[PDB]
Design a binder for this molecule. Structure first.
Ligand SMILES: *[C@@H]1O[C@H](CO)[C@@H](O[C@@H]2O[C@H](CO)[C@@H](O)[C@H](O)[C@H]2NC(C)=O)[C@H](O)[C@H]1NC(C)=O
Ligand SMILES: *[C@@H]1O[C@H](CO)[C@@H](O[C@@H]2O[C@H](CO)[C@@H](O)[C@H](O)[C@H]2NC(C)=O)[C@H](O)[C@H]1NC(C)=O
Ligand SMILES: *[C@@H]1O[C@H](CO)[C@@H](O)[C@H](O)[C@H]1NC(C)=O
Ligand SMILES: *[C@@H]1O[C@H](CO)[C@@H](O)[C@H](O)[C@H]1NC(C)=O
Ligand SMILES: *[C@@H]1O[C@H](CO)[C@@H](O)[C@H](O)[C@H]1NC(C)=O
Length: 1210
């Protein structure tokens, strides 16, 4: 009757991927040519050109999207056009072509390292379809806790999408959180270096998992297990505390575990006041287990929110909309107070509508599901509401009784836009669907006979849509000779990696009258990977020192990356999560609606809303859019990382290699992820291999022992054979250590089944470094039966020998002498002698000394200065705190040579769009105001601040003159020689106003703000300020005012009254290494203004340059005062101090050949280019402490710091 088209394409186009475009025809046509073209900025390509048929036919194809014109984002138009018989359909819509973000992660082999170990890390980058990419990382950097780049890798290539890089830490690497940052972006991975010892057991809460307010008492089961799965006996101390927003009430439980290793005790509600409004409903169970003999302890903390929820139901599988005059279906998940599956609970159901309120009573099943089917014949196309409750009566809660309530299920249903009386309904598929299994979808339909047109075939077009893109399609054809009967057909679907975790299915049918009948559901698929990889072991538990078979099952042509780590590492620090939820979560939230760039809105629930809720553009002339009204072994091993490997996968898809178990009785958590270019990414579940021995030895020893004390060694012997035995242990005696005559290191003891016994020694360490401790156990034959039975001897593994290292550090208090130098040749050779001297009362073998060369001041945060320009602001005080740092950032960058034209152009565009937003904030008195025209008189601090900003902003963008002169005249009018300052304004932000900002510092700040753009001394508006401030320096009050007075007399051109208060300023400088600083946040302001004062005089000596580098080395470590706009004026003074420092003395490195020499002619040569000048280079000094000469040649300055650490006796 009326022929019509329908064109489907996704909303968000993604450049590295292919997409789908689809066209649906009608009977008729057959001479009108439909072509669809994507008009982008530079060109226009056609998608598909096709002609109509005598039936409906869903014709669709893939395509490659053109690149965006802007580089990362472009709004393109899509246009369908059909020509023929002198008529031409044309219709255009807006789509968005953006470059999608490639998800990058990095993992390490451990989350925790000792000093002296090796850090391996893998960097993987993915598309949104989890296919790996081989783009070039520009720079991988590895950074200290002091934000010093200790390693970098330039232009690194991934193989098969993954790259693995290694770093050997120094054995005196300083502790803390080290960072791996990738490709100069927000992708980082942290790891801690600290002094630890591996724990052998895990304590966990078991029975309190969720708690209810209505229960009377609850059992606490604290249960603790070894890493190899065996229980122990140990003293348990549990604190069960309720906190408050005031003493906190706790109940403390003391106990001993049993043969199952679990400890249970009841706790009553009378301990905790669960009725108090001022008391929190979060209870804290902190358990501490000290196991018997050795005295080593472990913790287990769990914060439980006690629940006032008594019963919760939600509409689990129920559509959001109903068809008029057709039955509605849904099903409700009903849960109790503990989210349990209720046994046949009585669930009431009340509706809300214009016809009235109806009631229904239903009984759930064993799984708590409530299938309900409702008759919608009388609702008559109205917005209805559904409420699933526990009782008909409104719920009454008593303040005297405990808080308890029921979560009633609430839902709002809208009528579907029905211009026809036909029906679609898809039965939902319950819980989380298995990925890759072919699911059967059973859809019911009812075709109206008056809208049937039974002389032609009726077609059903379906799209299965995942992550905002068309995945699979079809058009089921069936005869209209059935006419009107309640029928059902089926669809065979398959969910894969391209499908969402919650993909959607849209089914419609178009009648020749023009009507559409449709239904859309959302599925629920588990987080799936197309590369189905399984990592397995056989026999999956074996004695240590033996070979297991390791099996990868991935797609053929994959590169697998395998990590097998000890569980004892994971008991200290939990590693960063590499699970399927984490990999899916870094691609943000899937494509729910149209973007704001290409959003369509009504100019004033249907199939257009169906394709909007999946984020797909529809173009159709049908009735789509609704009208809108508005035997022995030695156990030496490496118990930190067992396996860290890359494995190619052949054509079989299975790789089985033999790997040897390390000699630690523990559990190895193993995991693997594989990358294939055809199939994509796959992630194995974490499996475990239990390395276990029947009876064995275990040392209890700390990490570091200082030399010459006595420490308690505790060797525990475990027996897990099922009968009583007799052991004989012996500790090896060597010259590395001494013992205090504890039974001559030979004891024999009868130890029974499932039991541990601990021998103690107290040991003096005598030789420095890593020393060994060897102890062995043998089961000897019993001449007499101990315990009533003869001592059991096994057939295999009758002896166990264990060797464990101990780090030994020298005794005495550690003192350090640090010495700084700035070697800056300017075309010459610059040399400097450094003497290493020490008193003669040292402990021997304590003198460590290392030199450090660093080519550039400050580490990562110069790239954070690029991040300071973004997020534009034009409302409130958000603009004035952000317009100011930009000119100082580019002032520092153009004086350091790191300014590029792209960030310059983007920054001056930001200066234009912020410069035009400072004119409506201008006060009516010719001043400046935070509100704009309201604030009273002009604020002296804010007008001084904007004369500071626009006095330096004319060298980048055009600034009008007249604001400077009328602001100058208002400084002349608002200041008197009798009375200066007169602050009448305030900042909009709370608890931060800038500096200390009293009256004398405000006068000093405004008088500093008057000069240094075009002005000098003895002007009329600075003469009254210096008359106010000549006697202000005589007062010698405060520290911020003192440093700012030292700065404002540095710009006055005098050298007599400014150096006299620097003598009382440098003596109170607190010293941290070779980085001296002051503190009265505010400390950065004091150091920046003191640095700005010290580099103002034209005569500069090398002691002042060394003092300036000492200030700058403290300013280099700050990365929150600059790099973020959290402070209104700390960033501007810090960057102008660093910019004036780079003006005066320090140009950064370009090429320095440095060489150090000693008395033993130890010639050590450092080469510093312009590409590794941020790499913190260092080297130890093997020569006995004395003379060291330092000579550098080339262009640039280098910072050379010599640190000598040694220990002395008090
Ligand atoms: C994500 O990875 C893809 C794959 O390399 C990148 O696509 C490349 O983009 C550059 C841009 O200059 C093109 O020259 C290449 O031809 C593209 N390659 C492919 C295979 O499409 C994409 O730019 C990356 N996106 C991000 C945000 O890094
Ligand atoms: C403990 O003594 C041994 C023997 O001198 C040291 O070296 C080990 O030697 C065996 C011999 O094959 C190797 O298999 C081990 O891998 C070595 N251990 C290492 C490299 O850690 C051992 O270093 C000593 N322990 C110390 C000094 O802490
Ligand atoms: C366990 O908790 C206590 C109390 O805060 C703390 O002193 C102790 O260091 C903790 N032990 C470990 C291994 O975290
Ligand atoms: C993927 O995640 C789901 C839960 O989101 C869960 O089944 C499991 O952690 C993973 N399953 C598979 C098969 O990877
Ligand atoms: C060291 O061991 C001996 C032998 O048992 C003991 O008498 C002495 O008290 C121990 N010293 C310390 C400090 O524990």
């Amino acid at each position: 009757e009326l022929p019509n088209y329908l064109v489907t394409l996704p909303a968000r186009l993604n450049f590295p991927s292919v997409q789908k475009v689809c066209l649906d025809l009608s009977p008729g046509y057959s001479d009108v040519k439909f072509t669809v073209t994507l008009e982008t900025k530079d060109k226009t390509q056609k998608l598909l050109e096709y002609s109509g048929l005598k039936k409906r036919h869903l014709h669709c194809i893939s395509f490659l999207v053109p690149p965006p014109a802007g580089g990362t984002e472009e709004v393109a138009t899509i246009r369908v056009s059909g020509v023929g018989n002198n008529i031409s359909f044309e219709e255009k819509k807006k789509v968005l072509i953006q470059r999608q973000g490639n998800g990058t992660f990095v993992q390490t082999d451990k989350p925790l390292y000792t000093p002296g170990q090796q850090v391996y890390f893998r960097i993987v980058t993915m598309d949104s379809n989890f296919v790996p990419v081989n783009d070039k990382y520009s720079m991988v950097e590895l950074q200290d806790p002091n934000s010093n780049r200790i390693a970098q890798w330039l232009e690194v290539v991934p193989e098969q999408g993954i790259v693995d890089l290694s770093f050997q830490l120094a054995p005196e690497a300083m502790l803390g959180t080290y960072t791996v940052a990738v490709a100069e972006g927000k992708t980082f991975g942290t790891f801690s270096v600290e002094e630890y010892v591996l724990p052998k057991f895990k304590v966990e809460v078991v029975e309190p998992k969720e708690l209810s307010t209505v229960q009377e008492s609850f059992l606490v089961k604290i249960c603790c297990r070894y890493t190899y799965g065996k229980p122990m006996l140990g003293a348990v101390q549990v604190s069960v505390c309720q906190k408050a927003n005031l003493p906190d009430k706790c109940r403390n439980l003391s106990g001993q575990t049993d043969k199952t290793g679990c400890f249970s005790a009841p706790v009553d509600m009378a301990t905790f006041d669960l009725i108090g409004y001022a008391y929190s409903h979060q209870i804290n169970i902190v358990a501490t287990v000290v196991e018997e003999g050795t005295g080593v302890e472990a913790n287990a903390t769990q914060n439980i929110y006690i629940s006032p929820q008594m019963g919760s139901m939600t509409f689990e599988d129920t559509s959001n909309f109903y068809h008029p005059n057709f039955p509605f279906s849904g099903k409700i998940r009903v849960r109790g107070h503990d989210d349990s599956f209720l046994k046949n609970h009585l669930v009431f159901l009340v509706i809300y509508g214009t016809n009235g309120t109806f009631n229904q009573t239903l009984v759930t099943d064993n799984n708590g599901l409530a299938p309900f089917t409702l008759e919608t014949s009388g609702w008559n196309g109205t917005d209805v509401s559904l409420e699933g409750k526990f009782q008909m009566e409104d719920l009454v809660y008593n303040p005297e009784q405990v808080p308890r309530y029921y979560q009633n299920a609430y839902l709002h249903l809208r009528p579907f836009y029905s211009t026809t009386r036909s029906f679609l309904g898809i039965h939902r598929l319950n819980g989380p669907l298995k990925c890759g299994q072919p699911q059967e979808v059973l859809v019911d339909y009812y075709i109206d006979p008056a809208d049937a047109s039974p002389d032609q075939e009726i077609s059903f077009s379906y799209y299965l849509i995942g992550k905002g893109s068309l995945v699979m399609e079809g058009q089921k054809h069936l005869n209209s000779k059935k006419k009107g009967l309640k029928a059902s057909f089926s669809l065979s679907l398959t969910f894969t990696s391209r499908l969402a975790p919650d993909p959607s299915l849209v089914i419609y049918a178009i009648f020749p009258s023009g009507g559409v009948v449709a239904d859309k559901i959302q599925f629920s698929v588990e987080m799936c990977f197309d590369n189905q990889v399984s990592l397995g072991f056989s026999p999956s538990q074996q004695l240590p020192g033996a070979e297991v078979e390791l099996q990868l099952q991935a797609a053929p042509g994959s590169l697998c990356a395998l990590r097998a780590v000890d569980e004892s590492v994971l008991l200290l620090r939990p590693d960063r999560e590499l699970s399927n939820r984490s990999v899916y979560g870094m691609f943000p939230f899937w494509y729910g609606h149209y973007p704001y760039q290409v959003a369509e809105y009504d100019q004033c629930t249907d199939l257009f809303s169906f394709f909007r809720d999946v984020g797909l553009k529809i173009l159709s002339n049908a009735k789509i859019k609704k009208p809108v009204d508005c035997d022995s072994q030695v156990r030496q091993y490496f118990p930190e990382t067992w396996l860290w490997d890359l494995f190619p996968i052949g054509n079989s898809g299975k790789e089985a290699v033999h790997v040897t178990v390390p000699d630690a009785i523990t559990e190895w958590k193993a995991m693997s992820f594989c990358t294939s270019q055809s199939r994509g990414f796959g992630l194995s579940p974490t499996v475990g291999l239990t390395a276990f021995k029947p009876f064995f030895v275990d040392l209890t020893l700390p990490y570091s022992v200082v030399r010459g004390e006595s420490f308690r060694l505790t060797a525990t012997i475990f027996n897990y054979l099922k009968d009583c035995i007799r052991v004989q242990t012996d500790l090896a005696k060597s010259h590395e250590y001494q013992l205090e005559s504890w039974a001559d290191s030979q004891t024999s003891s009868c130890l029974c089944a499932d039991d541990a016994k601990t021998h103690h020694w107290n040991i003096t360490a005598v030789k420095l470094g890593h020393i060994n401790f060897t102890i062995s156990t043998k089961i000897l034959d019993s001449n007499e039966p101990c315990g009533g039975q003869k001592g059991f001897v096994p057939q295999k593994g009758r002896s166990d020998t264990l060797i464990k290292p101990v780090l030994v550090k020298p005794e005495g208090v550690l003192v350090e002498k640090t010495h700084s130098s700035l070697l800056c040749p300017k075309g010459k050779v610059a040399s400097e002698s450094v003497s290493l001297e020490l008193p003669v009362d040292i402990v021997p073998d304590s003198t460590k000394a290392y030199v450090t060369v660093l080519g550039d001041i400050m580490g990562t945060a110069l790239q954070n200065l690029d991040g300071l320009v973004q997020m534009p602001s034009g409302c409130g005080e958000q603009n004035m705190v952000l317009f100011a740092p930009i000119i100082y950032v580019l002032q520092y960058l153009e004086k350091a040579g790191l300014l590029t034209e792209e960030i310059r152009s983007r920054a001056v565009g930001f200066l234009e769009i912020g410069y035009q937003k400072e004119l409506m904030y201008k006060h009516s008195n010719g001043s400046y105001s935070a509100f704009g025209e309201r604030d009273g008189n002009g604020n002296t601090w804010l007008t001084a601040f904007v004369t500071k900003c626009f006095g330096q902003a004319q060298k980048f963008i055009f600034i009008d003159p007249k604001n400077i002169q009328d602001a100058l005249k208002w400084m002349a009018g608002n200041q008197l020689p009798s009375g200066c300052y007169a602050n009448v304004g305030n900042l909009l932000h709370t608890a931060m106003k800038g500096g200390v900002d009293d009256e004398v510092s405000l006068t000093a700040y405004v008088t500093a703000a008057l000069l240094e753009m075009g002005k000098d001394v003895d002007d009329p508006m600075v003469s009254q300020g210096l008359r106010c401030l000549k006697n202000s320096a005589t007062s010698t009050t405060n520290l911020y005012t003192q440093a700012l007075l030292a700065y404002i007399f540095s710009l006055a051109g005098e050298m007599d009254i400014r150096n006299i208060l620097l003598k009382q300023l440098d003596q109170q400088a607190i010293i941290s290494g070779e980085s001296i600083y002051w503190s009265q946040a505010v400390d950065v302001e004091l150091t920046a203004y003191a640095l700005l004062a010290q580099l103002t005089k034209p005569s500069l000596t090398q002691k002042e340059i060394a003092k300036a580098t000492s200030i700058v080395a403290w300013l280099a470590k700050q990365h929150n005062a600059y790099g973020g706009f959290s402070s209104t004026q700390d960033t501007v003074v810090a960057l102008q101090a660093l910019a004036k420092y780079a003006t005066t003395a320090y140009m950064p490195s370009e090429e320095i050949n440095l060489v150090v020499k000693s008395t033993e002619n130890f010639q050590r040569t450092f080469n510093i280019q312009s590409v590794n000048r941020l790499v913190f280079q260092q080297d130890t000094l093997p020569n006995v402490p004395g003379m060291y000469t330092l000579e550098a040649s080339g262009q640039g300055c280098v910072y050379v710091q010599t640190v000598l650490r040694y220990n002395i006796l008090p």
